[PDB]
Amino acid sequence: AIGPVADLTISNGAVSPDGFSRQAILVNDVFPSPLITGNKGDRFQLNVIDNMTNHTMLKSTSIHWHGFFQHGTNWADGPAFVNQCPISTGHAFLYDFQVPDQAGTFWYHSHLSTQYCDGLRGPIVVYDPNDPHASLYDVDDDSTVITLADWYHLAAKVGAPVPTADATLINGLGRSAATLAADLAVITVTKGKRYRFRLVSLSCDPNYTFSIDGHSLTVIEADSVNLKPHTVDSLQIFAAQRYSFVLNADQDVDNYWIRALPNSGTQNFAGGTNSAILRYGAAPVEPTTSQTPSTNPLVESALTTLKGTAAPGSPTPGGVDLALNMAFGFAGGNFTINGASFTPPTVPVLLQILSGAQSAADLLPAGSVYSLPANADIEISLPATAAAPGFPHPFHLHGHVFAVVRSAGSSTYNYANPVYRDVVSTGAPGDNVTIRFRTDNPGPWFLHCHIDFHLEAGFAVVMAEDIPDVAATNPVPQAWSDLCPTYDALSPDDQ
Ligand SMILES: *[C@@H]1O[C@H](CO)[C@@H](O[C@@H]2O[C@H](CO)[C@@H](O)[C@H](O)[C@H]2NC(C)=O)[C@H](O)[C@H]1NC(C)=O
Ligand SMILES: *[C@@H]1O[C@H](CO)[C@@H](O)[C@H](O)[C@H]1NC(C)=O
Ligand SMILES: OC[C@H]1O[C@@H](O)[C@@H](O)[C@@H](O)[C@@H]1O
Ligand SMILES: OC[C@H]1O[C@@H](O)[C@@H](O)[C@@H](O)[C@@H]1O
Ligand SMILES: [Cu+2]
Ligand SMILES: [Cu+2]
Ligand SMILES: [Cu+2]
Ligand SMILES: [Cu+2]
Numbered sequence: 001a002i003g004p005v006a007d008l009t010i011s012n013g014a015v016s017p018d019g020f021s022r023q024a025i026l027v028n029d030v031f032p033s034p035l036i037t038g039n040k041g042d043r044f045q046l047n048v049i050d051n052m053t054n055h056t057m058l059k060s061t062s063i064h065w066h067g068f069f070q071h072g073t074n075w076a077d078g079p080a081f082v083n084q085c086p087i088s089t090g091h092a093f094l095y096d097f098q099v100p101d102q103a104g105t106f107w108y109h110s111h112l113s114t115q116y117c118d119g120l121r122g123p124i125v126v127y128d129p130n131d132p133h134a135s136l137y138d139v140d141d142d143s144t145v146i147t148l149a150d151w152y153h154l155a156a157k158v159g160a161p162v163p164t165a166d167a168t169l170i171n172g173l174g175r176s177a178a179t180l181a182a183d184l185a186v187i188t189v190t191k192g193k194r195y196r197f198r199l200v201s202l203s204c205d206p207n208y209t210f211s212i213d214g215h216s217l218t219v220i221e222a223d224s225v226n227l228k229p230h231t232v233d234s235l236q237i238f239a240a241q242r243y244s245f246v247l248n249a250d251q252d253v254d255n256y257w258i259r260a261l262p263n264s265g266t267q268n269f270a271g272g273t274n275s276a277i278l279r280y281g282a283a284p285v286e287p288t289t290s291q292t293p294s295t296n297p298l299v300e301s302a303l304t305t306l307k308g309t310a311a312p313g314s315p316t317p318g319g320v321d322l323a324l325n326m327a328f329g330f331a332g333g334n335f336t337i338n339g340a341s342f343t344p345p346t347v348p349v350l351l352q353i354l355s356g357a358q359s360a361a362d363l364l365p366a367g368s369v370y371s372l373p374a375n376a377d378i379e380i381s382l383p384a385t386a387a388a389p390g391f392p393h394p395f396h397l398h399g400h401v402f403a404v405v406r407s408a409g410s411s412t413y414n415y416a417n418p419v420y421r422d423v424v425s426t427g428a429p430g431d432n433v434t435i436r437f438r439t440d441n442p443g444p445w446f447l448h449c450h451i452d453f454h455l456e457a458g459f460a461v462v463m464a465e466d467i468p469d470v471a472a473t474n475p476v477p478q479a480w481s482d483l484c485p486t487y488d489a490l491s492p493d494d495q
Contacts, residue, residue: 001142004038005045010061010120012054018167018174019182020153025057025119032172033122035145040103040128049092056157057118060086060495064111066240067224067422069399073097074350074443074474077398078111081344082446082462085484086112093479103128104224105198105242114156114452117204123147125198132306133220136246140196147171148260149202162453165206165265170258170276177266185276189249197247203239204452206262210235212278213256213289218246219298223421225401226306235298238394240423240450253280255287300407303419311403312436313377315415320377320436328388334458335388340367341458349444349462353470360464374466376439384431390454392425398445406434423450442466442473
């Protein structure tokens with residue numbers, strides 16, 4: 001309902017999404033963060049005005065626009081100390097970028113420390129006037145956006161380092177163990193109408209097993225990539241993933257439970273926890289519908305792109321220009337990738353390159369940056385392992401969509417017609433989730449676990465793609481150049 005040109009004023013305030021009051025982060029004075037929309041190929045101009053006064057949740061901020069390639073605008077990607085210095089409080093900063101060739105469901109979130117868990121996170125929809133699936137549904141609007149999110153009664157820097165959620169929020173509303181009377185979200189449908197629901201995980205940690213009582217879900221989009229329609233009776237959605245599904249409201253007029261079962265914390269539905277309501281003329285009361293066992297769950301390896309696009313490269317292991325393997329580990333309270341743990345450098349990686357850094361060995365942090373050649377095929381394997389606790393780890397690559405040639409829970413490789421997405425579960429020990437992309441987007445791009453508490457503990461690397469062309473391809477506005485001198489002048493209590 002706002003965008004693609006809009007102010008986003010960030011501030012602190014009290015919120016009670018699950019009937020429990022706590023300080024949090026507001027965007028345009030609301031929680032949860034408001035929906036942003038625009039059309040395929042639009043210019044987005046999002047002026048982030050930072051008015052936060054709470055140091056415990058960080059006064060500074062930085063917003064990542066999740067899913068957007070940001071070609072030519074790497075300075076706008078969001079990750080703190082990779083792509084920019086944070087916006088300092090009392091200041092504003094204009095994100096100004098274009099989305100050529102992209103349409104689907106996205107989201108925006110703080111990409112500073114674990115700040116987005118404290119409430120700076122909202123959905124984005126990029127509509128396609130010529131959406132190949134337009135004819136599959138009648139309704140696609142603000143009312144068909146469904147968000148899932150974990151919620152904590154103690155703030156990110158106040159609770160335990162890897163906390164347990166007190167509530168699942170659906171559209172920013174949910175119940176906790178001790179607030180069984182808190183208002184539930186209601187999604188309204190009219191009988192006989194078909195709905196494009198856009199489901200987005202704003203989660204800081206858990207994945208949700210999502211289903212709707214009595215209804216099947218026709219999945220048509222994954223992480224902004226159009227699919228061949230695939231009908232399931234449930235799906236598992238990892239932090240930061242998006243699915244569009246078509247729901248045919250063809251059941252009896254009634255109330256039906258919408259269910260989102262987390263993989264940790266409260267793993268039931270007692271008292272309407274982990275739930276929202278699908279309401280057709282039906283009475284304004286809770287559903288009393290029953291969960292049927294899932295017999296046709298979403299299986300990632302059975303998803304394919306609408307076009308049937310082959311994976312980049314030739315159909316054999318290591319059949320690409322560069323193949324990398326990321327060996328996960330954990331030691332000293334810190335995650336490692338190939339022995340190195342990510343620590344935010346004081347000079348953002350993008351500025352280091354603009355400043356004359358020529359190679360990965362030059363780039364800080366040492367051991368955490370990988371140089372990638374321009375205009376090439378890349379293959380990255382992310383073998384899951386017990387040495388990295390809190391699996392399954394959903395990994396996200398910035399600036400790119402990738403082919404998932406091998407999915408979690410599958411022993412097979414698909415090079416011919418694999419799903420493409422931008423967040424992938426690396427699964428359980430024994431898995432070897434394997435991705436391929438093309439280096440068509442010069443810049444440093446974060447590659448990290450989207451469990452935010454893991455990223456904070458260093459579960460991340462930086463892909464420095466086509467270093468020689470970074471500066472020329474990504475001219476920076478003066479307001480971006482001013483970020484670091486402003487931030488570095490702040491005393492630590494104001495950060
Ligand atoms: C700034 O934000 C923090 C973290 O949200 C607030 O921390 C609360 O601190 C009080 C008193 O120590 C505790 O009772 C709460 O449990 C904390 N809240 C959370 C969500 O962890 C702090 O109060 C905020 N500052 C101001 C001035 O409002
Ligand atoms: C995963 O696949 C990569 C690339 O083929 C390979 O090098 C690595 O040994 C594999 N790891 C495991 C644990 O299977
Ligand atoms: O950090 C949580 C704290 O919140 C305060 O408001 C009190 O309720 C304390 O008993 C408690 O220790
Ligand atoms: O013995 C290990 C070596 O085995 C060879 O057959 C190749 O596959 C090499 O990539 C590998 O390093
Ligand atoms: Cu993200
Ligand atoms: Cu992203
Ligand atoms: Cu993780
Ligand atoms: Cu990221």
